[PDB]
Amino acid sequence: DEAEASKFVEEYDRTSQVVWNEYAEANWNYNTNITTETSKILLQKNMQIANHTLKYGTQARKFDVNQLQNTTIKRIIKKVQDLERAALPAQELEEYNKILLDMETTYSVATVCHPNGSCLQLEPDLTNVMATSRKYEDLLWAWEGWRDKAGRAILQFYPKYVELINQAARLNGYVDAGDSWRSMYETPSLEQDLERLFQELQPLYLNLHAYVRRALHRHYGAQHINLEGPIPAHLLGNMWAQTWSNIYDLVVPFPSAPSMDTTEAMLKQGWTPRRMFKEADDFFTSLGLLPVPPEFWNKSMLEKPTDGREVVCHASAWDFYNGKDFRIKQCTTVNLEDLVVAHHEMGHIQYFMQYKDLPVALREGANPGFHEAIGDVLALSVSTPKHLHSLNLLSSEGGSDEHDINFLMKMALDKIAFIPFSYLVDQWRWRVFDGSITKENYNQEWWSLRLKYQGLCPPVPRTQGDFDPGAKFHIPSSVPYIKYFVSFIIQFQFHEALCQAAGHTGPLHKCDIYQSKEAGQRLATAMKLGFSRPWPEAMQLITGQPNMSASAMLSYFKPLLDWLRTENELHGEKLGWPQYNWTPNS
Ligand SMILES: *[C@@H]1O[C@H](CO[C@@H]2O[C@@H](C)[C@@H](O)[C@@H](O)[C@@H]2O)[C@@H](O[C@@H]2O[C@H](CO)[C@@H](O[C@@H]3O[C@H](CO)[C@@H](O)[C@H](O)[C@@H]3O)[C@H](O)[C@H]2NC(C)=O)[C@H](O)[C@H]1NC(C)=O
Ligand SMILES: [Cl-]
Numbered sequence: 001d002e003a004e005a006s007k008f009v010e011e012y013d014r015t016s017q018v019v020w021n022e023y024a025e026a027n028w029n030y031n032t033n034i035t036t037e038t039s040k041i042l043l044q045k046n047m048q049i050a051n052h053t054l055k056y057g058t059q060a061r062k063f064d065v066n067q068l069q070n071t072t073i074k075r076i077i078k079k080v081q082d083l084e085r086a087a088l089p090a091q092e093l094e095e096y097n098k099i100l101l102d103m104e105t106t107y108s109v110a111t112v113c114h115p116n117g118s119c120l121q122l123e124p125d126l127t128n129v130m131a132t133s134r135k136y137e138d139l140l141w142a143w144e145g146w147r148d149k150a151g152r153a154i155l156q157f158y159p160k161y162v163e164l165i166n167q168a169a170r171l172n173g174y175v176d177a178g179d180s181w182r183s184m185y186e187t188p189s190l191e192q193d194l195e196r197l198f199q200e201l202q203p204l205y206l207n208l209h210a211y212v213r214r215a216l217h218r219h220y221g222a223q224h225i226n227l228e229g230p231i232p233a234h235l236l237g238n239m240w241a242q243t244w245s246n247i248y249d250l251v252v253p254f255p256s257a258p259s260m261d262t263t264e265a266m267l268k269q270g271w272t273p274r275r276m277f278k279e280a281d282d283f284f285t286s287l288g289l290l291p292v293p294p295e296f297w298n299k300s301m302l303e304k305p306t307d308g309r310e311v312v313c314h315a316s317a318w319d320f321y322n323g324k325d326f327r328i329k330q331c332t333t334v335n336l337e338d339l340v341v342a343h344h345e346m347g348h349i350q351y352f353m354q355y356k357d358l359p360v361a362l363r364e365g366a367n368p369g370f371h372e373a374i375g376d377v378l379a380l381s382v383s384t385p386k387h388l389h390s391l392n393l394l395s396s397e398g399g400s401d402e403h404d405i406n407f408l409m410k411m412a413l414d415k416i417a418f419i420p421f422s423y424l425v426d427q428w429r430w431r432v433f434d435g436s437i438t439k440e441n442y443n444q445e446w447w448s449l450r451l452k453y454q455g456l457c458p459p460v461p462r463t464q465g466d467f468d469p470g471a472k473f474h475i476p477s478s479v480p481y482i483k484y485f486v487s488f489i490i491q492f493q494f495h496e497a498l499c500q501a502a503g504h505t506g507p508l509h510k511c512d513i514y515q516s517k518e519a520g521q522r523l524a525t526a527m528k529l530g531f532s533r534p535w536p537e538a539m540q541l542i543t544g545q546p547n548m549s550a551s552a553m554l555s556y557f558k559p560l561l562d563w564l565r566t567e568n569e570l571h572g573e574k575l576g577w578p579q580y581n582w583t584p585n586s
């Protein structure tokens with residue numbers, strides 16, 4: 001009966017709020033204070049939520065969902081029939097949760113040490129090395145050391161994790177875990193769609209890749225860069241070569257049009273991690289969107305503690321499922337890169353606040369890509385030279401083609417370069433999940449995709465025992481990654497649409513939507529839907545059409561593509577890496 005399904009949904013929602021809230025705090029306390037005590041409590045609360053999940057998951061499966069007239073109820077019940085890990089027998093559930101905590105703890109406490117003295121952590125020490133050093137050998141020491149410590153130490157857990165996560169998924173009706181993760185998008189054509197989208201950005205990526213390779217050749221020398229081969233993975237200013245903006249100094253198109261040192265500028269003017277979130281909070285309120293509650297400031301962890309405390313440093317945002325308590329945990333460093341991250345995270349918080357009146361089951365993004373896109377959309381405006389100048393972090397750069405092409409390169413090194421990395425991660429994991437990649441081939445298959453999609457090679461040949469994917473946070477933390485790919489495509493579709501709505505004319509990359517209430521309304525109406533409707537409804541609301549599309553991104557960067565083509569031709573570059581077998585001779 002319809003009414004029995006309505007009662008169940010009401011019961012599931014009341015008890016989920018309480019249970020999910022207690023979990024959230026336990027998980028929070030461990031994430032911000034890694035100890036044995038908090039570790040134990042989190043594992044105990046894991047069993048409690050699993051017990052709530054099992055109970056309602058079992059009730060949910062006694063209902064025939066496609067014989068139910070109300071769609072919103074049909075949609076809630078369907079979700080609740082997926083128990084995720086709670087489908088496992090008791091022994092396996094216990095092993096799975098322990099393994100996840102073991103992998104996460106291992107990642108977060110790993111250090112890379114000189115035998116003489118100092119021991120470095122990932123954030124901020126090794127990060128800062130990858131961002132600032134221009135010495136091949138020092139970059140190499142950090143890149144390899146990180147992988148020797150975090151990557152190799154995760155390898156012992158992974159096959160068993162894969163086994164249990166797949167068991168869970170099969171018991172919830174999926175064929176494996178990758179299958180289950182793709183289902184979150186409710187888009188049967190997903191793989192084809194993502195591939196089409198990846199192919200559309202190849203012109204821009206291969207041209208970017210060749211130009212950066214050239215500038216690397218210039219700086220690190222011809223004996224260490226093959227201009228027809230892949231780039232060594234440790235020279236791009238980032239530990240995973242996922243964003244390249246930190247080597248802007250090596251690739252600046254017009255050196256005669258220099259930019260202010262934004263890090264120097266923020267420090268000299270007394271910017272704190274707290275001021276960086278206040279400024280993002282102001283952007284959101286300028287659009288007519290909600291302010292973060294007072295509680296957010298009292299309880300969030302906006303910097304790395306100076307306290308001895310071991311914490312999980314990866315930037316993230318938290319919903320406690322009472323509709324009032326939302327938090328960010330970030331090891332914020334005072335620089336431009338983390339100003340963008342602050343906006344990204346504050347986007348999560350705004351999404352939480354926007355859908356807080358929905359049933360808890362529908363309290364997530366239209367799809368996971370939408371959740372990651374909101375902050376980034378505002379950050380695109382914040383990032384414009386015009387806006388940064390109004391924050392006094394750049395001097396005037398307007399009305400000069402040289403600064404304009406420089407800005408677009410700066411943006412391209414983060415936005416375009418992340419397209420292939422973000423695509424690659426779950427191509428590898430999906431194939432791990434479906435058994436196409438065994439633990440004999442974890443690493444080799446990782447590097448085949450690194451080569452194929454990104455055009456990177458490892459600077460040091462990989463040995464038996466390496467598990468480089470373990471050195472990226474999301475692998476051991478078991479966080480799906482394709483969302484960031486979707487995110488980078490659609491945030492530009494959102495930018496374009498919001499700019500149109502705000503009355504901006506002229507090139508898209510000059511748009512700044514600060515204070516546009518018309519832009520605000522669109523985001524707000526879409527965010528309010530939560531997971532209540534299929535994601536094309538939200539896309540439609542924001543952009544006036546229902547597809548994912550690379551058009552907005554190609555239009556944003558079109559002036560850069562013309563400039564890269566002319567430049568690369570002028571120097572006779574081969575686009576791609578035809579000599580794909582090349583690795584550093586050294
Ligand atoms: C299918 O059912 C959904 C879900 O609504 C509800 O869930 C059930 C389990 C029961 O608890 C119901 O009592 C409960 O309504 C219906 O969605 C709901 O529709 C109503 C009617 O418009 C919405 O009411 C609005 O509430 C806001 C307050 O924020 C007011 O400002 C509006 O003026 C209006 O009163 C309600 O918000 C909405 N909720 C959700 C989650 O969708 C839906 O109408 C129904 N569909 C059909 C075809 O019957
Ligand atoms: Cl790697």
Ligand SMILES: [Zn+2]
Pocket residue numbers: 344345348371372
């Ligand atoms: Zn995010």
